[PDB]
Amino acid sequence: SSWRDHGISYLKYLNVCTETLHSTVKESRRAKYERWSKPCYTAQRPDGAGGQETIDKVPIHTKDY
Amino acid sequence: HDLPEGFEFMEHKVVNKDIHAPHENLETLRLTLTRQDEFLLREEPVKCVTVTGTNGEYGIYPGHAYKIVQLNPSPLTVEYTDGTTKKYFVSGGFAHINNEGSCDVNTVECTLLDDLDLAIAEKELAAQQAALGSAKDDKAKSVVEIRISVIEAVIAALKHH
Amino acid sequence: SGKLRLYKEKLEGYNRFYSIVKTIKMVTLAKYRAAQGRIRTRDFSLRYTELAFSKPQASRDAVVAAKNALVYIPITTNRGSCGALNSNIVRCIDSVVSSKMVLMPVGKRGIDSFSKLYPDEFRYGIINDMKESMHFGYATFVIENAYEVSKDADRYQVIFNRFVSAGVQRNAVYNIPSYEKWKEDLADAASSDNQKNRYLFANALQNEEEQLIRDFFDFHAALAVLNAVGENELSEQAARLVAVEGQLTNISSLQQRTSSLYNKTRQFGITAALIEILS
Amino acid sequence: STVAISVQGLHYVGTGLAAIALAGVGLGIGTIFGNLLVACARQPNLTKMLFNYAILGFALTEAIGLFALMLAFLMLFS
Amino acid sequence: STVAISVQGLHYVGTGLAAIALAGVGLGIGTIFGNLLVACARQPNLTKMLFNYAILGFALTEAIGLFALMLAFLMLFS
Amino acid sequence: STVAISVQGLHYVGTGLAAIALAGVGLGIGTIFGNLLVACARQPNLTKMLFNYAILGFALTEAIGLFALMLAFLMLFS
Amino acid sequence: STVAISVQGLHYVGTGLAAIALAGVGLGIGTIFGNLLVACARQPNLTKMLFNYAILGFALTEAIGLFALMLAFLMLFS
Amino acid sequence: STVAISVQGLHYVGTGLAAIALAGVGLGIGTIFGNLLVACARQPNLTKMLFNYAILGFALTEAIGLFALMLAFLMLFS
Amino acid sequence: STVAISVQGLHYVGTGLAAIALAGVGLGIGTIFGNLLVACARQPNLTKMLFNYAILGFALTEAIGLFALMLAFLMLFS
Amino acid sequence: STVAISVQGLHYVGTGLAAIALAGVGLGIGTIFGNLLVACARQPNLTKMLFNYAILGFALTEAIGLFALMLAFLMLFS
Amino acid sequence: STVAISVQGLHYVGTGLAAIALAGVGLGIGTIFGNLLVACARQPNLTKMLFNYAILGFALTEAIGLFALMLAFLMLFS
Amino acid sequence: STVAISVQGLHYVGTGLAAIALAGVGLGIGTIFGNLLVACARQPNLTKMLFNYAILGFALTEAIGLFALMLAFLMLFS
Amino acid sequence: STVAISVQGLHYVGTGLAAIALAGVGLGIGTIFGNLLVACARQPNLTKMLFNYAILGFALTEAIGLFALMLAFLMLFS
């Protein structure tokens, strides 16, 4: 609705919807469903020193959108 | 050197009916309900499927015209020819309807309405309403509105039956 | 004195190595058992994605014709010991070297292998901790990063491993053209008698708005990426099992060799000492 | 001069004019049913509801036509 | 003066006006079938039901037409 | 010269013309009870609110219908 | 007094009015075929049933037009 | 030669014509409530603002209708 | 009294009214072709059948047009 | 001969005709608002620009209506 | 008594009534070209064929208008 | 006999008829703006451009009304 | 017996009836430009092309009105 005007893409909207739906699940089943929405992905580039410089091209969590 | 394409390993193709061909009266619809590259139903024959699209609800019966529907967070009903109703809830995705008698509903998340609970939705809605006032900026407000809409749809689906 | 001690010490080391590898085998077998359920539930999500993107095309014209960035998103595993999957992916990438090539690999091994070989064609890589199930959010992250790497990109080629069977892991490709080229092809299919299999699909897409079409495009690209990563994970597990079994066999052979040498050394030393002492 | 005139054949003309109202009535009815079909082809499970509402519409537009008809009779027998 | 006059020919004009009601009725009927097609293409499996409803709509619109015709036949033959 | 006439029968003709005002009125109602159906299929959960709004629109159109009917009756019994 | 006047030409004007009904006939027919095309574009394999239903609708609307023509010819030859 | 005639009944005819405009008003109202419902189905969250805008449109259309009705009534009593 | 009149020019009036029928004919044709284009936009490979059906509908409407024209010619040349 | 006649009540007729010009005006306004609602449902963030354009359209349509009403009042006072 | 009255100014009314028929031809052409514009955006690759079909439809509507003008001129002169 | 009759009030009637033309013009203008809204809510980035075209259409459509209005004045001031 | 009457003021009625035809032309132009505005928002890249076709329609829709307008003069100045 109003999220398009702010530049939020469709995929982020889908991720938010799925996260909310999982949060609405019963206590017992959530243990499974929550495994399909927890962010565990990151962007890295190897620098000269060897440190894995982390990129900020795309937000990982929904609150950062 | 010619690499394959991942679609060659999937032999369950899509049957598209030709333009200049005779009509057939179908009594069942082949449904294919999918969540994150995983199906719950595999070409299951059903009497009808009710899907809540963006413009409005669609009641798909055998022989429906070819169409593409952009789903919204909402319930999805499947009624078999036997007379048994199965209700899911979806958070998003697409529905492809074919005039040959097939309906492929590919959702990001499709979970049984029973699995959902009421009090959890109410408390999450209250928390989102409280956070809306403290939204950092416009984007946070839009995100909280999205979450609130999803929760309201879930609660309405639960209260309906 | 020294020979026997060294042989026994290295034999003990090999024994510990074998035990560690056996534990690794058991853990990987548990993971393979958990992940094998996908096979029943696959090969049905991507049906209209085929119509959206499946196109029998030459491997030369599609490459030379483009004059904008050609993004490549090879799928690679975080941990080694998988086998020849990463090597084959690297070979496939090398065969497709071009001035327009851009790499956004996935996995630590892919990053470490494409950073050195291709420094000027590498921007950054994505990493996922294999803690949760491969979900849609990860695919969306990959797609968003790919777009931000090169928004004016001719195509986005995903290279992954397809797990045909327990012992067969081929290399598969998903090609994701730019929105403009996809729109042109879709319009040609809808109007012209050519592409007769996509005529209804293209006409259905055209009837709808443009935002819906763009959302459809992004959604099916994400689905393709999700399928790729899932198949790559399954293939990685299978190849890890195979390579672990091979390593176990090699370790057992080396332990047998060392035991034979230890027996020979002890007998030789005992007899030599006895002869030179009491004779 | 003060010529009071009573043309007896005019009460036909007015009657006909009243009947023209039915043109906007019948057409309206069609529209309802038209949409009804499109509403049934979208959510057939709701037909038993929609039909009632459609009937209600016909029960209102028709009630309008009667009024016109009433005039078309009052002027046709007076 | 009191000049009553009986112009016979007027009983034709009114009749013609009544016929104009058929302009609506006809159109309305067409509209129904129009939508019917758009419905029968959308969900052919329901054609039968839709057809019945379409007939119902016709059976109503034509009814209005009857009244108009009656008026005509009640003024042409008068 | 100075001349004046009083044609009584004309009081019918106007009464007919006012009746034509109902042609739109009835049609208008149809439009409402058309879209209502299309609205109830898309959002069956909102049948009550849409029905109330349709009743409101029907009353608003009936107001104009009664205005025209008042004009017609006044020109009929005058 | 009462004055019976038998005008001859008034049997023409009414005729010309009845023909106006055909305006609401032809348009309706157009509508039908219009929708038909759209239907054949949406469900082309269902062309035969749509064609037959459109023919039925055309027959009914043409029957209405034939009634109007009956009235027109009755007045023209009267 | 000069003949000045004051026909009294004509003031009825015009009055009726002034009422015909009401149709174009009444139909319009339905159109508003024909689409309002759809909007309420498309975006139920805006059930309030859309209602106010529709009321504004109805008020303007009713102002037009009253402007016509003033002419209708002035000629009925003069 | 017993009286009888015959006006020569009235046969013009009716003729014109008959021509008004064509207003509902030509428009109808446009409607058809309108929809035709839309159909040809979403089913380019089914153009021949759509064109044939459009021609059929045009001829069917032209039948009504020719009926009205025949009435007009009968009232203009006699 | 060279006869000349002036009729008094004719200005009531023409005036009424001008009032019919307000039928398409009011209807037009409704149409605007109709579409407006749909637009506000499709793009709810544009609740003010669309309102401004609707007001502009109403102003132009009302200017046309006032052009007609000027004639309607002027003939009524001639 | 018998009166053979020949009014010399009645052909203007018939000519105007016939000219009214162009209100349908113009609207039909407008509908044709509106649908043409809608279709070209939908499927721009077929612009030429759609243009040809629209030209055909316009030619047919213009033929109808030519018939109406033939009647109008014939009445105006004859 | 042969009488050169000159009626004076007729110039009102014709004038009123001309005003009926505006009933279309007004309506047409509304249609434009209607679509304009549906076009601004479908691609707001083009709003300004769209607005310009809309104005152009008005400046054309309005012109037609002026023609009709001119005729009215010519007959109303003669 | 044979009586010849030459009414001088009847050309006003015919001129107004001819002017009535401009309503259809205005409505057609409005429909054309509304469809243009809708289309451009769907395929902006081709806007210019669409515009040309729209103008063509106007060129082919205004001309008809001219003919009607022409008749008006041919009766207003005669």
Ligand SMILES: O=c1ccn([C@@H]2O[C@H](COP(=O)(O)OP(=O)(O)OP(=O)(O)O)[C@@H](O)[C@H]2O)c(=O)[nH]1
């Ligand atoms: O201005 C417009 C025009 C059209 N559309 C959109 O274009 C599409 C045309 O779709 P259709 O007209 O072909 O189908 P439909 O009546 O079944 O539509 P739905 O109920 O399924 O929506 C529909 O999805 C409509 O919402 C707009 O969103 N805005």
